[PDB]
Design a protein around this ligand. Structure first.
Ligand code: HEM
Length: 151
């Protein structure tokens, strides 16, 4: 569980993300796909992309990045009180999209990496630790629903 101070650090950088949601989403999905290529193959929309330049040039990738970060921001702003928000996401990601929890770990690492690059003065160590706790909590709670569902 995060303290109020930790949530403050998390949401302070997140409000910066929300000034350029689409650029952050591109950098995060691209980072994810390069670092962990098994993740790209889970996307029928994107698995044709074979180079970073192709990924950067894909408007549909940019659109999905906005979808992802918009959903994550709504979760983070609930400061842990996010049950309602996680129910449909776990259901589709476990049962329809078939995404392992490890791949949620991979996108968490991509998020943290991109935040560090784009917002270093608001993403020093205290903030990094706070954000990692928030994304761990996100994973802990999705994993409990994956377990309910036998995934
Ligand atoms: C921060 C973590 C993530 C968030 C907030 C997120 C959010 C979303 C949202 C909002 C949708 C559309 C609604 C739905 O189907 O539930 C979606 C779709 C999808 N997600 Fe995620 N997602 C996350 C991580 C991942 C990861 C790591 C993968 C794959 C490795 C993944 C694969 C998919 C797929 C395949 C779809 C369907 C795309 C389509 O064909 O339109 N998601 N995600």
């Amino acid at each position: 569980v995060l303290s109020e101070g930790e949530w403050q650090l998390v949401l302070h950088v997140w409000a910066k993300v929300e000034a350029d949601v689409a650029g952050h989403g591109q950098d995060i999905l691209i980072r994810l796909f390069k670092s962990h290529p098994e993740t790209l193959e889970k996307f029928d929309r994107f698995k044709h992309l074979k180079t970073e330049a192709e990924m950067k040039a894909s408007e549909d990738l940019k659109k999905h990045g906005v979808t992802v970060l918009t959903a994550l921001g709504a979760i983070l702003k609930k400061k842990g009180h996010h049950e309602a928000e996680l129910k449909p996401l776990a259901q589709s990601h476990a049962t329809k999209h078939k995404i392992p929890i490890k791949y949620l770990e991979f996108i968490s690492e991509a998020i943290i990496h991109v935040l560090h690059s784009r917002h270093p003065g608001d993403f020093g160590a205290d903030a990094q630790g706070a954000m990692n706790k928030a994304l761990e909590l996100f994973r802990k709670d999705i994993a409990a629903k994956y377990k309910e569902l036998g995934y």
